[PDB]
Design a protein around this ligand. Structure first.
Ligand SMILES: CC(=O)N[C@@H]1[C@@H](O)[C@H](O[C@@H]2O[C@H](CO[C@]3(C(=O)O)C[C@H](O)[C@@H](NC(C)=O)[C@H]([C@H](O)[C@H](O)CO)O3)[C@H](O)[C@H](O)[C@H]2O)[C@@H](CO)O[C@H]1O
Ligand SMILES: *[C@@H]1O[C@H](CO)[C@@H](O[C@@H]2O[C@H](CO)[C@@H](O[C@@H]3O[C@H](CO)[C@@H](O)[C@H](O)[C@@H]3O)[C@H](O)[C@H]2NC(C)=O)[C@H](O)[C@H]1NC(C)=O
Ligand SMILES: *[C@@H]1O[C@H](CO)[C@@H](O)[C@H](O)[C@H]1NC(C)=O
Ligand SMILES: *[C@@H]1O[C@H](CO)[C@@H](O)[C@H](O)[C@H]1NC(C)=O
Ligand SMILES: *[C@@H]1O[C@H](CO)[C@@H](O)[C@H](O)[C@H]1NC(C)=O
Lengths: 164, 321, 321, 164, 321, 164
């Protein structure tokens, strides 16, 4: 991955998290569970939706009858016609194949970037109140209950509140 | 006490290709390539196609006896020929500018056949009853329904002159033919005049025909030939026929308003009451996606044809459960 | 004591579209789409176009009496016809290969009209004075300025033979016509000979014409027709006319150097002394940008035509004041 | 943003900085003010200038008269001509539209990346002689005068010269 | 006490362009643009081209006396004309649908010349000995090898009728000609019938020719003209000739099986024993790369033609030694 | 660089390392030398190879005779033929030129990304057992022999085994 998170230092995905593309897994004394980050998921969705629609809707054509008919003394213009059809076919096939190859790469780089940005957002919030395991997990140096876990997910986490 | 950052995974087996890597499994994806069709020939712009059945366009226009039971509407968005359209010009010869006529008739909005030169009052001094085994109706010698074979009545073929004025308020399609006997003997037997000629004229069209008498290989048992000609008579214009022989005269003609930019589809697929924006010879297809692999030949507002068997776009991310 | 890292912001309202997000406000941008024109027809390659005004190309070449006030330079980069160009062949008939000739004249250098067969000395034994109500000038019957109508002198029309050799060091465009009376009565009245013919030949061109006497609808009051023919006579080559009647003879012809790759524009926009690299029927446009939505049919070195109303490229960054 | 800086952990732009795309805001006892980074600005400018010129100048065209004239027995080649003109219209319109959408995304990513690179360049030279506040600001653990700030902007900053 | 992370560098001088920066030195790269050719005309897909020597295709087909070769090869993938292919129709006139024929003959998988109407037994009632100074072999008047000039025997030119049935199991190319005297005097001298005509017909082809008598400039010393015509006769079909004069009769014809989709290259480059998938007039080119700047007009499976002088793709990374 | 490593905080490349695209230089009491990372090099190679093969092999090539012959009364369709050939020329020249420019940018960004990802991979392994000098170099807070250096390159480096 271009940004090093997906299939990167975060080795795999979570089938447990069903409600979003990106999110959190928490473990504390009250229990464990998955929660999706709604802001980053919904932005990614908005983004990809606009991409797909751009590729689809920018294609506009006029009413056209492709086929043409020529007698046996018209062979030259018949082959001209064939050269036009085949030329358009070569261009559209090549371009469509590459557009999908190239834009598929970018879409995966996009998801990878979103995951990395989310990770570093949490990292910057926790600072030294938590330890970095490396698999995308932070181990707290203090007790963190559901309300604490939520402040982290909410981006509202209170750093000075823990010197414990 | 730990919190982890991670990403979605599921049981999806969808794969896409990327520039760096083939066959990558992703959680979600969408198809950009229209890969299916409905197996039917449908309406384009709310209008059904012309179906010619056993006949091709030439047979239909000339009134080939095999075309009698065709039902023609007053409008069509395109024309359908099948692998069963064999019945054309049953009298051997050349149909002039035939491909052009087919193209220019591919869509019309108010089409009517009418009797331009009535059989009963038009030719008192010529025989109109001529038929041939080359044009057969149920195993019996017959002729085109829309034309009349004029031969001599008794010993003579008097000079004929006939004019039609187009009062229909639209274009009139007029077809005729010129017969070419293999021998001078047959020429006199039919038209009596060895020196015969045909002239047709309008405000635009001007042409003169003379019989070409020559020995030829037999086609459908005939060494004779019959050539077919047509013109679109503009509203208000007049067309005039003169002949001392060999004219295959207009009986019925067609009044119409030509549409544009349509064409002819050759397909054995059944015609149905559905509507579509894109017609293919295999069947109709959805026009929403940008690309389609159904068929290189289409009529409509259509996705672009590509050679691709697969175009699939990643929406979600790498699926790693 | 603090130092901060940050980025530029301003009052720019420029918006662009991106693949992930529509309508993004950015600090700086550039336009890739040329959406305006100057409303004028300008010079291409430093040369003004041929303007035909009231007349189309046929009227101009034949010398239709209404085209007398048009003016032709010795060169032009393209040709402009208007919605008012109606004055063509005023004597009804066919102009053969007309579209081809129009194309071959679309740009020329070194163009000159000259008198190929002078009216006064060329036809001592024939009447040259023929006119018609069909080609009228200022309320009086007239004829094409560049052609001459030869009829019988007294009771006799002797066979004529006339040749021209091209010494002009460039191509010579020669136009002529063949007249077709409605009746043999008229044939004898004008050309005296029932058997009359016209023959034209050169190193390339070979044809013999016969008058076709037939009933035809009246066009501009005439049941007669006059067909128009042309050829490009190569430098050094000879062209020979022989006729016993029905020839409409060349009087003036044109020597020229044909250009290439230009065309014909139909526009009512005023012609001016401005220069452009790209001309559209609406007006001239800048050729600097890669794309333009002004018009698909152009002449020049032109941006590619697209359906886009906006193509705007981000240069600066996301504007967040 | 793909690189997480613009509209990222740096939330907004500076209308105060008029002389560059990316730069610094400094605060000390002598005063405050904006200073643009000249190297990173000019490098970004050269790049974007080259991108635009490529899109514009790679288009090479020959003198062409697009229009053609056909009589009423030429309907087929007239429609062949139309199929060619329209086919070119569909191709250029599609490609132009997508080219701009895609490259606009890349230009914005380019700007985001440049801001981040500048931030981490400053961060790596200052190290622990300053505190990472967030929103792109470093709070110094020593006194930094106008002469000191310029060394940071110039990338010549002297770390061992300050231990406090 | 140290470990460092770094990247590869070398002595590579390769440069690439990127959208942000020109002339970037990289460690590794590959070329996408085929900029060279082998300077030869080669076999295309393992079959040699037809070489016509002194003659062009018309001269070769008609048997211009200067085209005497070892033999027409029995198959070819395409056709080569050179700056030395000068010997065409040595009797001046028009070759009808000549470009069409050239295209349709551009590749064949079997070709044989045969005597369709043997000179010795075919024309007992006509003179076969006609020659001309316009077609000369070794300083003496001669004629086309593949055609026969029929003139009147004694005072009379009886109507001739001659038929050929195609038993060859493939197409037969039949060529013939029609002679056009400048004067009726010459018409009577050769043909005696002034009303003379030629008729050629098959199940498909039907056409009639009459001589067009006109005064014309001399070409190769002749004011006369000769026009050339052809048809492809299908296996099993018959072609029939009838003439009262002016027919230049088939002597030899060609039996053949057409390939499809080839063309003509005009080059003086020598034909060689090399093989290629893409032939250019400059030379053969390699088909592996997607683009080539050698030449826009090619024959084969070819890279797309572009104006680029350089297309080079970085594979490795920025080279910073 | 988009990712800030190549011509970035790592100023130059190694002519000394001949066996791979990305790798390591180590110095300890036993000696110094270059070693290439084979996993990341080979991955990059696989990717770039796939990119190259895509650009080349996605091009459809059918047997075609481009040329056409027209007589002197065929100028209009002759120019139509020319409009088709030139039209295809404009499209292919433009698209190929931009495709190479754009994808070259992406290929360099890819290498830059790979270098950065590798650097951060080593860094997370070493943690506080070493000092980050910059220029891509880590100075150990302990003694590291050839077997130890191999563990870092192998990604097997043992953190708890080293204190001090
Ligand atoms: C006129 C006639 O009956 N002639 C007979 C000979 O033709 C016949 O030998 C056979 O004739 C066949 C042609 O017959 C038709 C046809 O096409 O079916 C008969 C049609 O009635 C006649 N139509 C008209 C209006 O006259 C038609 C017509 O003459 C030609 O189509 C015009 O070109 O001919 C066919 O050619 C066979 O190949 C031929 O052997 C014998 C036997 O009776 O004598 C005549 O009665
Ligand atoms: C085969 O082609 C060659 C040309 O490649 C013909 O040879 C000669 O062609 C020249 C034209 O370049 C003819 O020139 C003429 O010369 C006479 C005087 O010699 C002059 O009066 C004419 O005005 C013209 O310039 C030349 O006649 C001709 N040679 C002969 C013997 O006729 C050759 O004729 C061609 N042969 C066939 C069978 O096609
Ligand atoms: C063209 O000139 C003719 C006379 O030559 C005149 O009858 C006609 O009205 C002119 N054109 C138009 C559109 O009026
Ligand atoms: C086209 O318009 C003017 C020509 O007067 C030119 O200066 C300008 O640069 C061109 N347009 C753009 C967007 O560059
Ligand atoms: C074409 O053949 C191979 C494959 O591309 C290549 O090695 C060779 O050099 C090419 N030939 C020429 C003459 O460039």
């Amino acid at each position: 991955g271009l940004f090093g998170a997906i299939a990167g230092f975060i080795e795999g995905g979570w089938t447990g998290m069903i409600d979003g593309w990106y999110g959190y897994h928490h473990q504390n004394e009250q229990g464990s569970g998955y929660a999706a980050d709604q802001k980053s998921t919904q932005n990614a969705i908005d983004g990809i939706t606009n991409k797909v629609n751009s590729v689809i809707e920018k294609m506009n054509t006029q009413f056209t009858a492709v086929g043409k008919e020529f007698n046996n003394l018209e062979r030259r213009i018949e082959n001209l016609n064939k050269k036009v059809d085949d030329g358009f076919l070569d261009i559209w096939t090549y371009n469509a194949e590459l557009l999908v190859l190239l834009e598929n790469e970018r879409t995966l780089d996009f998801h990878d970037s979103n995951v990395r940005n989310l990770y570093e957002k949490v990292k910057s919030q926790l600072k030294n109140n938590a330890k970095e395991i490396g698999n995308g997990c932070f181990e707290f140096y203090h007790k963190c209950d559901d309300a604490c876990m939520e402040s982290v997910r909410n981006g509202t986490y209170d750093y000075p509140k823990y010197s414990e | 006490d730990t919190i982890c950052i991670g990403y979605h995974a599921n049981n999806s087996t969808d794969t896409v290709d990327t520039v760096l890597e083939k066959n990558v499994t992703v959680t979600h994806s969408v198809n950009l390539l229209e890969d299916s069709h409905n197996g039917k020939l449908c309406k384009l712009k709310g209008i059904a196609p012309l179906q010619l059945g056993k006949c091709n366009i030439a047979g239909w226009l000339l009134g080939n006896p095999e075309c009698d039971l065709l039902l023609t509407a007053s409008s069509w968005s395109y024309i359908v020929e099948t692998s069963n359209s064999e019945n054309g010009t049953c009298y051997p010869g050349d149909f002039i500018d035939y491909e052009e006529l087919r193209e220019q008739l591919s869509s019309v909005s108010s089409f009517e056949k009418f009797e331009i030169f009535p059989k009963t009052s038009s030719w008192p001094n010529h025989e109109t009853t001529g038929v041939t085994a080359a044009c057969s109706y149920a195993g019996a010698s017959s002729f085109y329904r829309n034309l009349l074979w004029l031969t001599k009545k008794g010993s003579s073929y008097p000079k004929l002159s006939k004019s039609y004025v187009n009062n229909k308020g639209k274009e009139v399609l007029v077809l005729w033919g010129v017969h070419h006997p293999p021998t001078g003997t047959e020429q006199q037997s039919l038209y009596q005049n060895a020196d015969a000629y045909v002239s047709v004229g309008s405000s635009k069209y001007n042409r003169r025909f003379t019989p070409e008498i020559a020995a030829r290989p037999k086609v459908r048992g005939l060494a004779s030939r019959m050539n077919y000609y047509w013109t679109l008579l503009e509203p208000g214009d007049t067309i005039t026929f003169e002949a001392t022989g060999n004219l295959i005269a207009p009986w019925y003609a067609f009044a119409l308003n030509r549409g544009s930019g349509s064409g002819i589809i050759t397909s054995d697929a059944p015609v149905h009451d559905c509507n579509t924006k894109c017609q293919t010879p295999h069947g109709a297809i959805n026009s929403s996606l940008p690309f389609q692999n159904i068929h290189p030949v289409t009529i409509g507002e259509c996705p672009k044809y590509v050679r691709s068997t697969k175009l699939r776009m990643a929406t979600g991310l790498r699926n790693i459960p």
